[PDB]
Amino acid sequence: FDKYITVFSPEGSLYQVEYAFKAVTYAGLLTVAIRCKDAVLVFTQHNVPDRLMRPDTITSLHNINKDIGTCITGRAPDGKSLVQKARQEASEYKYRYGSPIPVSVLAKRVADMAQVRTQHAGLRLMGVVMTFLGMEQNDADGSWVPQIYCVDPAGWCGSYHACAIGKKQIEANAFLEKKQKNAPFHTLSQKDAAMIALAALQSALGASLKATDVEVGRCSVEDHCFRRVPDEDVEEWLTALAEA
Amino acid sequence: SILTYSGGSCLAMAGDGCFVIVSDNRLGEQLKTISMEVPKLHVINESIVLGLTGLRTDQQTFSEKVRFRNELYKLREEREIGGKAFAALVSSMLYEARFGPWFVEPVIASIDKRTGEVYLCAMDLIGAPCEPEDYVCAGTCAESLHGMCEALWRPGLGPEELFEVAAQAMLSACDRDSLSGYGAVAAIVTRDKMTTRLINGRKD
Amino acid sequence: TEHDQSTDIFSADGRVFQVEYACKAVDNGSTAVAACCTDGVVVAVEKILTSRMLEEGSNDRIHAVDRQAGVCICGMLPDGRAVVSRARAEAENSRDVFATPIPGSVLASRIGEFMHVYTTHYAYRPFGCSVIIASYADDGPQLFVSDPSGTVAGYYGIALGKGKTVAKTELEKLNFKSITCDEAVVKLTKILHDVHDKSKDKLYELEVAWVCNKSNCVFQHVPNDMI
Amino acid sequence: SYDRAITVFSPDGHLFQVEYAQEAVRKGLCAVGVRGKDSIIFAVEKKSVQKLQDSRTIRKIYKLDEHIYLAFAGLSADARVLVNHAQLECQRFRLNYEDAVDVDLLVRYVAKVQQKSTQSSGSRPYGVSTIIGGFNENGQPHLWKTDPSGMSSAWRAVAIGRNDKTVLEFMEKSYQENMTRDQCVHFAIKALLEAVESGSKNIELVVLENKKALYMGDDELRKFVVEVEKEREE
Amino acid sequence: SAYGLTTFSPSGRLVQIEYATTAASKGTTALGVKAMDGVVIAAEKKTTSPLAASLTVQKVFVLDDHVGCTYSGIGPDCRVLVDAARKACQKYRLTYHEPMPVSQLVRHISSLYQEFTQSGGVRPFGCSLLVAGADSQGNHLYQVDPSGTFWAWKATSIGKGSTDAKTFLEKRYTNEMEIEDAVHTALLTLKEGFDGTMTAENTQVGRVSEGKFELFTVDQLKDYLDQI
Amino acid sequence: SSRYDSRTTTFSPEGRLYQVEYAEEAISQAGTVIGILTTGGVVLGAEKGVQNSLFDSENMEDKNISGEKMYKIASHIGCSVAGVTSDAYALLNYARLSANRHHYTYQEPMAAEDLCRLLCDEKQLYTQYGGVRPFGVSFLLAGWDRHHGYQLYHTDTSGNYNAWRAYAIGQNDQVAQSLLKRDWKPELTLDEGIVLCLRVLGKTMDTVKLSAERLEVAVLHKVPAPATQKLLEPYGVLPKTVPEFKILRETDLKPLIAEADRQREAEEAAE
Amino acid sequence: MSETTIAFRCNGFVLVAAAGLNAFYYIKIMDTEDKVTQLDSHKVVACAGENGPRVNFVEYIKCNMALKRMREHGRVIRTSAAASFMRNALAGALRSRDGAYLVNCLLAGYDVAASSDDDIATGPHLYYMDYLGTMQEVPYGCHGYGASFVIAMLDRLWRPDLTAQEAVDLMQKCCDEVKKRVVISNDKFICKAVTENGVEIVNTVS
Amino acid sequence: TTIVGVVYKEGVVLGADTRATEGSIVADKRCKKIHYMAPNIMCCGAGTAADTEAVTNMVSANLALHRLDTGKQSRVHEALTMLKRHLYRYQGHVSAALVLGGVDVEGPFLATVAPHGSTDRLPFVSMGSGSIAAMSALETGYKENMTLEEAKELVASAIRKGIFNDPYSGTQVDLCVITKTKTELLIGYDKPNERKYPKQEIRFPPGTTPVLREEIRRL
């Protein structure tokens, strides 16, 4: 009964929330995000099993507006419904206050959408983790700083230096923890950050990657916009890793 | 004019740790007089008096709504409301009827029990306040009253001297007005006591 | 096993069983195939007849949704018809409000969104159809599939329904960069005649449509002589 | 807004929510009405005698208009809601037609409210049976009963609540046409003491006559009870 | 869905309110101490991993310039109460042009908890709050639970390590403490129950004094941790 | 979703409403509450829970509006509650609003039985319409009005009410009701009533000496009328005495607790 | 103002009078309409205005007062509470969609003790009201074109200690002066007294 | 009313006069016309007093909520957008004209908002019934990169043109200086209208007024 709707079990837990988190791994893909000195990057597996599928129509990355990107991990159509609600939110904010929504504010608004379904009966929770990426401005000096914020099915909202989500996330997080001990990720260049993210994917999947197996997104101090990184730029990061 | 249909006027003045507030007694229908015993003052608590002028049906309706909100405030908050919060409440109730107003013009006087500071306010009929440190006036003989007070008021009067000045201002102005008169009532408020007096005037 | 009574409940493993059951209705239906050439797109489907006394055109599975785009339904036909209506309304909205023919990728994503919303609420059930969408607007020829989960993808060639495993094998021996829309009709029809099972379903016919340069980017049924 | 169906048919034509409501009525205190020539009596059992109860007892016979009264059995809180609806309808009728409401027409309004509660989604039936009595504007007395299904009927004497079926058999034998105001009071007290234990302060009583109503005092009631307790020994 | 999820049971218990109260009592530890001239509240913020950014995690909130709060239990549920409380404070200023008293704000919050124990289609909130503030009647510290019940305290604690913390405060509390001695006492009480090393990055502190509520920065908190 | 509906407003098979019975069981587990009708007023008394040292005062400006257990509804009506505390606050607000709207419309005070009947109708509604649990509260109400004088009512979870010369709700209500049935009399004064209340709470709590920190007492009585401003209200007429609800402090109880301990030591002597 | 109404209170009574006229433009339809309506055993209201609003307003007040009576054990309501309810209905209507009730009233009553606990000052009361919702307790009052003549007479001749006989005489002089000086014909008056024994018609006034 | 603003090198200076009138009478000789919006943002208002007061209070409260939610300093463009949207919905019936100024991470910002809901961002503005007279000093005196002292002297001279030449403006000058780090209010910055002839004192002997009755009450 506690297994079927949002009420508490006797130990204080919510089972539909636990099960919505297994939906995140059931989908079978892995994502990694990392923030370095001047940028934020996100690397997700591009799976095109069927040889007849048109690869440029399958994506886990989307723009919310010009300057904010998302990566969906988990049940794919659930994630597309949250992309549409986030788009609507960012456009209401701009009408009301006359400026584009900051990435920390947007993440909190989507986290509230999720919490409402853990507390009202009759609508299914969405079985996804949404990762949001963007640059944010300081009020002191006016300089811009990259951010990563993740939102989970319970309505939790949090910021990271780097994060792995999906199948074998436990092993990929362990891996990034080790690498962090050498140098904090905010001192690293793009290339060094990228070599750590690609090495973590490979280590956890237990395989070798070509450029066509990963899709990558980026925002930077140089160009605020969220943009897909070209396959040629990724090849050269993988080449650089294969050497060392 | 709807504001002059019913008759009546009100004045309040500030002193050293005291105020005086005064109203006329007439109630009419344009030039006809219905009653000569209708003062327009309402005691809200020991520290606050409200004077209301304007159309008499809206004085009676608006003062009943204010007394109802004040009763619920005391049960929720377990304290008496103070003068600045009371005037903010009244201004908010008038602006709620911005596009179909209550035809009343309130005058509010209060004294902070602790400090001895006096607070006066007058509002227009949609709630805009004005908070001088000397006197406020409203009603049918407002223009004359406003000029009598400017001539007679001075800083730092005690209760008895301040009473004399307010009575003379109210009686001189009412004698030049057809719609206000038949004497006046006054409340004199200090930290320690509240006195009330009936002032004799003309009978026309 | 109470977890499979409504679409608003996850199972312990992270699945939504009512949506899986709806997919089983599509997998037991008649076969469809489609291919994206350099000119256009071709769709073909098998109709299982329930009587030898039907008029021609009865229970058509292929429907136009704008001048330049069309839909083919697999699985339960009346459910498919509710999606056809929605799609017609989205194509009209795009012309009336934005003054454009709806791009193929946008049409497919709206159809997906609409189907997904019926997998979320205790009072509705999932659709029991998959839709093939074929379009040629200012984004070129495009072929998409949306299923009962609301998942949407783009293809060069595709097969659905009970013959799909074999049909897929035969679509993999085509050359998609080179083929024209007149060759395609011959190959696609052949695949459908070969997977037909003659024991179970005795009476059947084929329905075929296209949108291409030859037709002036108008979506239409092929003339019955080209079969 | 909750809109679940609560009252439904079951396999042999039963409406269980309506029969359960009828069981709450049979658990309730006993009530009696008696029509005479020119009077109507209502008599009701009370919860019990206590030292701590307040002497001014809460009334369980209600006035609906100057000329109409109501007694009941079942859930007391549901009955108060029904009384409130019937008081408003009596005044709505004066506002619309000028005349005072007839008793049979007010009984139809009440029965219709009960019937609707057995067919409206989102709500259960009233667990209440009523006895309603009054005089028209031509001095003729009426006495009616309603049940939780909405069925209404007119009676010369009637009983509801616990041991209704016993009190009704007693009344079937002894009732006579055209009784006096005092002969009616006797008959009603007597009928009640088939169910109830003593007759001290466990009876309230109302006498209704064309243009006069009386909640009987303790002294006048004691007189009538001893007279009846004497005749029950014979 | 429009039926109730919280219902009475044969011995008169409302079990969903107990289960929600069990969820609140398994959160991380928060506490509060009232001095004679202010109030301090504090909470643990340990992350699960060093890949999480510590700075952005908030356990102590400003509700208005004179009052703030902390929580134990389910965080996303607390955000709903914090938004409702902020809104109520501003609505009170628009009507009376003064700060909402803490007594009135707590009652507002309590009635929002009570609705989620009775309305149709909803479960109760799974968090307790500590509210601290200053008004005309002085400095106040209150606790509110998932039932909607509230209490005024001199010192108290909520969450996992809450029984040992309350025993430790009972010994060391006096009616004559200054504000600075209270900040010391609060940080000492946390350290007892803390698993690991208390740092200025994994703890958070707020203070009422001179009629204002303020979160300590990391730097301010480091000065206090080097003295204890 | 309909298969998980618990059907709170559905009759069960003997005309019973189970949620209403279960909420009544919750009341019988709460702190004891006593009420007594005298010739000088009504007394309400309640047991408070055990008194921790770290508890604080709200420090409210006016002390006779609310304690832990006693609440003012209007100048002539007070009450005391047993049951679910946050449910009591919701009904208390409804009563405050009802009683003060009546005064707005008629400019006179609401009758005590009328206020009690509105409150009980709000409870009855949740047992018949709308699919949620009922309120789990019982009230003792004390009032004064020009129709019937001093009154004491009790309300229950079904929405029924009754009138009493003395009564008890909560934990040990059969013990308390037995002692009151012995020692109540029609000719009690207000001070004799307060002593009779402290001795009954004394017995049920089961302590030889009465802790002044574990009790609460309120009274509804008539006091001399205040100002009579015939200059500002020329047609205003007050009477000599007006009702007041008062919550007794530790400096008003001290002598009355003494008198309750002496009568306790002279009842242990005869035995 | 085509119909005049008059009232005044003395030590143990209130007298109330009103003209009988019903008109259609310049034609008298009848001159015997009773406009002094009884609200309960010890209360009357005299109203001036067109038949439609007058009748619909007094039936609304009578209905609400009867309802309030039976949810209160049939106890007589005080005159100030009835006045307060009427004023609130007139003021309410003024700001409503249908508009104001165009009626002007005088309400009179005699208050009597409910029980032995009742500390009410027993006595007669008289309230002047207008169609806007203005309400004032007065010793005497009038509506209509005749009002100004009668008010001046009463300022000259009224005292609180008039006997019943002196008061009936004084009311007849007031009605005669309305007939003498007002162009609109008010030829028949109906008068009622309110006392500790209830409401009675005074037959010697017309 | 006369209200004025200018942009200088590091900030904004706002100014106002202090007379309120009803008809041809001076109701208040010292009304405040410079309202608080945020720690870095101020507003002066002309128009219907109640409307001006209500609008600025509502936006000031919604900006305070938004700072607690987001954690960031309020932007002057946000205030401007929120005012404009409210005024536009009421089609001029809420008759408030406003001068808004403040400083945020993108530097100084000054603008006007008309009652129908239109805006203008400029380096010097004026509004009210004295606006034409004040604008004559601004066009003769303004220049780029003024110091703080030049800017205070220029705003005070523009308000004095309204005070001496427009009958609905008067009494004295109030200023408000808004920099990156602080907001400073300077009430009575210039008082050019003192008393010329000292007020004759008119003593009434106590007992002068006839009284019929008296009641007393202790508190």
CA-based nearest residue to H31, from H23, H21, H43: H21
Cβ contact C13–A22 (<8 Å): yes
Label residue H147 left, alpha or beta by phi (over 0 means left) and psi (-120 to 50 means alpha).
Answer: beta
CB atoms within 10 A of CB D47: 13
- Residue F55 has φ and ψ, to the nearest 5°, of -65, 150
Residue F239 CA, distance from chain mean position: 26
Give the separation between CA D199 and CA D191, rounded to whole angstroms. 12
Question: What are the residues facing D157 on neighbouring strands?
Answer: D34
Partner-chain contact B167 H213, CB within 8 Å: no
* CB pair distance less than 8 Å for F9 and D25: no
Closest Cα in chain G, distance from residue F97 (Å): 18
Q: What are D212's two structure tokens?
A: 């006069």
SS3 content of chain D, % helix, strand, coil (to 5): 35, 25, 40
In this complex, how many residue pairs, one in chain F and one in chain G, have their CB atoms less than 8 Å apart?
Answer: 43
Opening angle at CA A219, ends A216 and A220, nearest 5 = 125
CB proximity E116 to A under 8 Å: yes
Query: Nearest residue of E to residue H56 by CA position?
Result: E94
Give the angle subtended at the CA of B54 by the CAs of B130 and H21, to the nearest 5°: 35
Pairing of the two strands H34-38 and E212-215: unpaired
Q: How far is CA F82 from CA B122, D86, F31, F48, in A?
A: 48, 33, 7, 12
What backbone torsions phi and psi does residue G167 show, to the nearest 5 degrees?
-70, -40
For chains F and A, tell me whether 3 or more CB atom pairs sit within 8 A of each other.
yes
Taking each helix axis from N to C end, the angle separating A76-97 and A103-119, rounded to the nearest 10 degrees, works out to 120
C59 and C180 Cβ atoms separated by less than 8 Å? no
Say whether the C–G interface has 3 or more Cβ pairs within 8 Å: no
Contact call for residues B142 and B130 (beta carbons, < 8 A) = no
**Of residues F152, F257, F249, the one with CA closest to residue F202:** F257
> Which 3 state secondary structure label does DSSP give D64?
strand
Residue D177's contacts (CB-CB under 8 Å, 6 or more residues apart) are D156
User: Is the CB of B89 less than 8 angstroms away from the CB of E94?
Assistant: no
Burial of C74 (0-12, 13-18, 19+ CB in 10 A): buried
Find chain H residues with C-beta within 8 A of A105's C-beta: 69-70
Paired strand residues for D41: D34, D207
Taking the Cβ of residue C6 and every Cβ of chain F, the question of whether any pair is shorter than 8 Å is answered with: yes
- In chain G, the N- to C-terminal Cα span, in Å, equals 19
Coil/strand/helix, residue C169: helix
Does H54 contact B at CB distance below 8 Å? yes
Report the amino acid identity of residue C221: H
Element spanning E88, H or E: helix E75-96
Q: Yes or no: say if E25 and E160 are a contact pair by the CB < 8 Å rule.
A: yes
* Residue B92 at interface with chain E, using a CB cutoff of 8 Å: yes
The angle that helices F250-265 and F190-205 make with each other, rounded to 10 degrees, is 70
Q: Do residues E125 and E81 make contact, with C-beta atoms less than 8 angstroms apart?
A: yes
Torsion of CA F247, F250, F251, F252, to 10 degrees: 40
Residues of B in contact with H50 (CB under 8 A): 91, 94-95, 98, 124, 126-128
Beta-carbon separation of G115 and F105 below 8 A: no
Contact A122 F1 (CB under 8 A): yes
How many whole angstroms separate alpha carbon D29 and alpha carbon C69? 76
Contact status, residue G1 vs residue G150, Cβ threshold 8 Å: no
> Are there at least 3 beta-carbon pairs closer than 8 Å between A and D?
no
Using a CB-CB cut-off of 8 Å, the residues of chain H touching E93 are 61
Distance in angstroms (rounded) separating the CA atoms of residues F237 and A150: 70
User: Min CA distance, H22 vs chain A (Å)?
Assistant: 36
- Cα distance between the two ends of chain A: 55
- Four-CA torsion G163, G166, G167, G170, nearest 10 degrees: -160
Q: At D190, phi and psi to the nearest 5? A: -65, -40
Q: Which residue of B has its CA nearest to E96?
A: B85
Contacts of F1 in chain A (CB under 8 A): 5, 121-122
3+ Cβ–Cβ pairs closer than 8 Å linking C and D: no
User: Phi and psi (nearest 5°) for G117?
Assistant: -85, -15
In whole angstroms, give the CA distance from residue E62 to residue E47: 22
What residues contact residue E117 under an 8 Å CB cut-off, 6+ apart? E6, E14, E16, E17, E124, E146, E147, E148, F86
Cα F32 to Cα F179: distance, rounded to the nearest angstrom: 14
Longest dimension (CA), chain E: 56
| Secondary structure of residue H49 in the 3-state scheme | helix
Contacts of F61 (CB under 8 A, 6+ apart): B78, B79, B80, E137
SS3 for chain F is CHHHCCCCCCCECCCECHHHHHHHHHHCCCCCEEEEECCCCEEEEEECCCCCCCECCCCCCCCCCECCCEEEEECCEEEEEEECHHHHHHHHHHHHHHHHHHHHHHCCCCCHHHHHHHHHHHHHHHCCECCCCCCCEEEEEEEEECCCEEEEEEECCCCCEEEECEEEECCCHHHHHHHHHHHCCCCCCHHHHHHHHHHHHHHHHCCCCCCCCCEEEEEEEEEECCCCCCCCCCCCCCCCEEEEEEECCHHHHHHHHHHHHHHHHCCCCCC
Per-residue DSSP letter, D125 = P
C194 in reach of chain F (CB within 8 A) = no
Structure-derived torsion over alpha carbons of residues A48, A54, A60, A66, reported in degrees to the nearest 10: 160
Please name the chains neighbouring A, where neighbouring means 3+ C-beta pairs under 8 angstroms.
C, E, F, H
Residue whose C-alpha is closest to residue C120's, from A81, A123, E122:
A123
A193 contacts in E (CB within 8 Å)? none
Q: Which residue of B has its CA nearest to F60?
A: B78
| Partner-chain contact H217 F227, CB within 8 Å | yes
Q: Are F235 and F68 in contact (CB under 8 A)?
A: no
Give start and end residues of each alpha helix (H) in chain G.
51-70, 79-94, 147-157, 164-181
| D52: nearest CB among F7, F121, F164 | F164
Q: Are residues G19 and G27 in contact, defined by beta-carbon separation less than 8 angstroms?
A: no
Chain E: nearest CA to H207, how far in angstroms?
41
Chain F neighbours, 3+ Cβ pairs < 8 A? A, B, C, D, E, G, H
Tokens representing residue H57 in the block: 């209070």
B152 and B167 Cβ atoms separated by less than 8 Å: no
The CA distance from F144 to B194, in Å, is 30
Q: Is E97 helix (H, G, I), strand (E, B) or coil?
A: coil
**How far, in Å, CA of D219 to CA of D225, rounded?**
10
**Strand ranges in chain C using DSSP code E only, listed in sequence order:** 32-36, 40-48, 62-66, 69-75, 129-137, 140-146, 152-154, 157-160, 204-212, 220-221
Instruction: Give me C168's structure tokens.
Output: 């897929």
Whether H1 is a known active-site residue: answer yes
C-alpha H211, offset from chain centre: 46
SS3 content of chain B, % helix, strand, coil (to 5): 30, 35, 35
Chain F positions in Cβ-Cβ contact with residue A121 (cut-off 8 Å): 1, 4
Structure tokens at F206: 């089961």
Cα–Cα distance measured from residue D103 to residue A29, given in angstroms and rounded to the nearest whole number = 78
Helix (H) or strand (E) run with residue H28 in it = strand H25-28
Chains that touch D (3 or more CB pairs under 8 A): E, F, G
Is the Cβ–Cβ distance between H52 and A66 less than 8 Å? no
Show residues of chain F in contact with A5, CB under 8 Å.
Answer: 1, 4
Whole-angstrom distance, CA of residue B201 vs CA of residue A21: 85
Query: N- to C-terminal Cα distance for chain F?
Result: 65
Phi and psi at D212, nearest 5°, equal -165, 135
| Amino acid at site F107 | Q
Q: Is H12 helix (H, G, I), strand (E, B) or coil?
A: strand
Q: In whole angstroms, give the CA distance from residue A74 to residue D45.
A: 69
Looking at residue D145, the DSSP 8-state letter turns out to be E
Can you tell me the distance from the alpha carbon of G39 to that of G61, in angstroms, rounded to the nearest whole number?
8
- Residue D231 CA, chain-centre distance (Å), reads 26
Residue of E nearest to A154 (CA): E76
A16 CB neighbours in chain C (<8 A) are: 9-10
Taking CA atoms, what residue in E is nearest to H63?
E90
> What residues in chain H have their Cβ under 8 A from chain E's Cβ atoms?
57-58, 61-62, 64-65, 68-69
Question: What number of residues does chain C have?
Answer: 227
D133 in Cβ contact with D64 (< 8 Å): no
What distance in Å separates residue E149's CA from the closest CA in chain F?
6
Q: Give residue A198's identity as a one-letter amino acid code.
A: L
Contact F124 D58 (CB under 8 A): no
Q: With an 8 Å Cβ cutoff, are E3 and D4 in contact?
A: yes
Residue A99 in contact with partner chain H when CB distance is under 8 A: yes
Among the options H1, H2, H52, H171, which is catalytic? H1
Picking from D59, D63, D91, the nearest residue to G63 by CB comes out as D91
Between positions 29 and 68 of D, the ones with CB within 8 A of G are 59, 63-64
- CB contact under 8 Å between G141 and B38, yes or no, is no
Contact C3, A1 (CB under 8 A): no
Residue H167 neighbours by CB distance under 10 Å: 10
Please judge whether F84 and E152 are an interchain contact, meaning their C-beta atoms are less than 8 angstroms apart.
Answer: no
What separation, in Å, do the N-terminal and C-terminal C-alpha atoms of chain D show? 62
d(CA B4, CA B6): 6
- Cβ distance C10 to A19 less than 8 Å, yes or no, reads yes
- In chain E, residues 85-144 whose CB comes closer than 8 Å to chain F: 103, 107, 110-111, 113-114, 117-120, 137-138, 140-141
Technique of determination: cryo-EM
Cα separation, B170 vs B202, in Å, equals 12
Q: Evaluate whether C181 touches C211 at the Cβ level (below 8 Å).
A: no
Q: In terms of CA atoms, which chain G residue is nearest residue D94?
A: G63
Closest chain F residue to C9, measured at CA: F1
In terms of Cβ atoms closer than 10 Å to its own Cβ (0-12, 13-18, 19+), residue E171 is: exposed
Q: Nearest CA to CA, how far is F269 from chain E (Å)?
A: 41
Q: Are D133 and D40 in contact (CB under 8 A)?
A: yes
User: Inter-chain contact G94–B57, Cβ cutoff 8 Å?
Assistant: yes
